[PDB]
Amino acid sequence: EKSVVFKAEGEHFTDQKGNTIVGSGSGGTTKYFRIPAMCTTSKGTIVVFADARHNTASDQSFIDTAAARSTDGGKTWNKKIAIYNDRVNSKLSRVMDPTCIVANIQGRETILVMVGKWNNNDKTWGAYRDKAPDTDWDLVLYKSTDDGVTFSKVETNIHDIVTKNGTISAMLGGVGSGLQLNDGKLVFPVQMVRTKNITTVLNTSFIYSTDGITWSLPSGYCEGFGSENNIIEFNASLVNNIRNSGLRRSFETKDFGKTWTEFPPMDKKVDNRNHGVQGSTITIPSGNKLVAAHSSAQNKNNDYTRSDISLYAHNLYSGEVKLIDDFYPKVGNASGAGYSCLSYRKNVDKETLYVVYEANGSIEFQDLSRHLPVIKSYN
Ligand SMILES: CC(=O)N[C@H]1[C@H]([C@H](O)[C@H](O)CO)C[C@@H](C(=O)O)C[C@@H]1O
């Protein structure tokens, strides 16, 4: 009823030379997977990115970005590494926390994946606020134009726009999926760690692009909260849905990121309890209306176990919220649990709703398409 995308202590990857990557999982396997991001193409192909945390679940560890590709509706997966860390520090070199977009970029169907990159930092990224930006940090972008078979680095101006801003120590995607707007614009939700002198330590915002190469930052910022976030398009607004300890937060911008105000249909509607968790938020059409589909954890133990990863529908008109499916009704592994990513498409006349999520160090997939009539009615 599920499939396993990446099995904890059950995968072997190879490096750029073709030599095996001996992780710390039993038999030299990759120890742990975290932070899934899924993008489905017009061909029905499913690509799932995740951190391959070869040695430990820790954020501060040796990590590559794995990619799993399914052309049979999520039954089987071909796996590889999409992005290798720089291999400076065998303990700490890492690429992590993917955000993906599937888009037609001036006609060309492309999967983009953006990850943060560190080498020698031994502490969490929010600790490094002395520089503009941190010298250990980067934010890299890879593309596939062959339906997810191969990924190549995109040379961008993302590092430059962060430096020129001068008030950002580091930036990361919002985690899970970004979006292509109706007009074609590419949008990644972002998280920012501000330089020490900025009283907000954290903010949310987005970067945008037409061609995937040259990106821009808006002049304004949204409050950070727990900073992981996704954006949806709703009329002329961009609307975010942000991790927060306790009740999730949602703001709208009507001026393309200059100012943000609370968005009542989603603000404070889902409780993730202590510490918060990443959540995935997307839209699903229902006639010429929209419904937001959202996944995050109920967290019944009020801790890092992040139990009960659940799908909700948000009525974007009335503000009602309901539980559609507690699709992972289990207590997670507090080493790292709870994260998810949704993906909706209508290809021809076939609508699909998929989810991937963290399951005891593995990444699982479910086809949630049976729930579409319920979600679509929720307008
Ligand atoms: C870059 C980084 O540290 N990201 C991590 C996140 C980060 O440490 C926090 O958001 C604080 O910046 C949190 C997190 C979790 O809560 O499970 C996992 C995620 O990989």
Give residue 162's domain range: 1-379
Ligand 1 first shell, C-beta below 6 A: 35, 59, 96-97, 116, 124-126, 227-228, 336
Atom of ligand 1 nearest to the CA of 116: 1
Instruction: Please identify, by atom number, the ligand 1 atom nearest to the C-alpha of residue 275.
Output: 16
**Distance between CA 157 and CA 214 in Å, rounded?**
6
Give me the residues paired with residue 38 across strands.
Answer: 48
- Categorise residue 209: left if φ over 0, alpha if ψ from -120 to 50, beta otherwise: beta
Find out whether 69 is annotated in a ligand binding site. Answer: no
Q: Is 376 helix (H, G, I), strand (E, B) or coil?
A: helix
Residue 63's beta-bridge partner residues? 53, 94
Give the span between the Cα atoms of 97 and 114, in whole angstroms.
8
Length of the chain: 379
Resolution (A): 0.9
**Angle CA 264–268–271, to nearest 5:** 150
User: Ligand 1 pocket check: which of 33, 125, 245, 309 to mutate, most ligand atoms within 8 Å of Cβ?
Assistant: 125
Q: How far is the C-alpha of 223 from the C-alpha of 226, rounded, in Å?
A: 9
Q: How far is CA 305 from CA 78, 323, 370, in A?
A: 29, 20, 28
Please give the distance, rounded to the nearest whole angstrom, from the Cα atom of residue 268 to the centre of ligand 1.
21
Q: Whose CA is nearest to atom 7 of ligand 1?
A: 124
Q: How far is the CA of 375 from the centre of ligand 1 (A)?
A: 30
Specify the DSSP element, H or E, that contains 79: strand 78-83
Whether 313 and 325 have beta carbons less than 8 Å apart is answered as: no
d(CA 272, CA 268): 10
Which strand (E) or helix (H) includes residue 227? none
Query: Which residue in 308, 370, 369, 366 sits closest to 2, CA to CA?
Result: 366
Q: Nearest-5° angle of CA 28, CA 29, CA 30?
A: 125
Ligand 1 nearest atom to the CA of residue 97, by list position: 20
Nearest to 286 by CA among 354, 351, 366, 240: 351
**50 alpha carbon – ligand 1 mean position (Å):** 14
Residue 213 to residue 116: CA distance in whole angstroms: 17
- Helical spans, DSSP H, in the chain: 158-165, 372-376
CATH code of 78's domain:
2.120.10.10
Q: Where are the alpha helices (DSSP H) in 130-174?
A: 158-165
Measured between alpha carbons, how far is residue 242 from residues 141, 144, 224, 295, 337 in Å? 22, 28, 8, 12, 17
Q: CA 47, 51, 52: angle at the middle one, nearest 5? A: 100
108 marked among binding-site residues: no
370 is in an annotated binding site: no
Strands 362-367 and 138-144, bridge-based pairing? unpaired
Distance 77 CA to ligand 1 centre (A): 27
Ranges of beta strands (E only) in 228-308 are 229-234, 237-242, 251-253, 261-262, 280-286, 289-297
Would you please indicate which residues are annotated as catalytic (active-site) residues? 59, 339, 358
Cα–Cα nearest to 80, from 31, 47, 38: 47
* Count: domains in the chain: 1
Of the candidates 206, 193, 188, 204, the one whose C-alpha atom is nearest the C-alpha of residue 243 is 204
